[PDB]
Amino acid sequence: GDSELTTQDGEDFKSFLDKFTSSAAFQYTRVKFPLKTPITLLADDGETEKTFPFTKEKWPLLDSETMKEERITQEEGGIYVSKFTLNEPKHKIFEAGYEESEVDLRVEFELQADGKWYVVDCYTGWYGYDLPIGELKQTIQNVKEENAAFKEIHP
């Protein structure tokens, strides 16, 4: 303990990501909002896309097991791929979905001039294009139930 190491050109990926996977209370300290990815619910109109506020209220506490890269080869569904899409110094994407279908998950990180990394995407199917404008609050309840397990194991 004591000292610090943070270098002089912005923090490592691995350095911020380490506490990302292993501290709930710290995830809240490194995120932009509304993000690139707002929630967008098809309205009562059945054609009107209407966005909603992205905030901490709708922050599912993610774990270290989503941070794996694989390429599942099915024959009765599709090729499920979790692999990087851009390799920049200050910017780092992580998309998972079928090879040629939707994504379940997008997570994106921008390094800020503060030298701390910040999340800029919070897509995870929880806020996918698959829930109606009515069922919003139901999901936000149940996001707290998943978030309890995470924080009981590794807060």
Report the CATH number that the domain containing residue 27 is assigned in CATH.
Answer: 3.10.450.410
- E-strand ranges in 64-152 read 70-73, 79-83, 91-98, 103-111, 117-123
CA distance 87 to 125: 24
CA distance 52 to 152: 29
Method of determination is NMR
Domain count, the chain: 1
Angle at 24 between CA 125 and CA 102, to 5 degrees: 15
- Tell me how long the chain is: 155
Radius of gyration of the chain (CA): 17
Range of the domain at 20: 1-155
Please name the helix (run of DSSP H) or strand (run of DSSP E) that holds residue 71, with its range, or none: strand 70-73
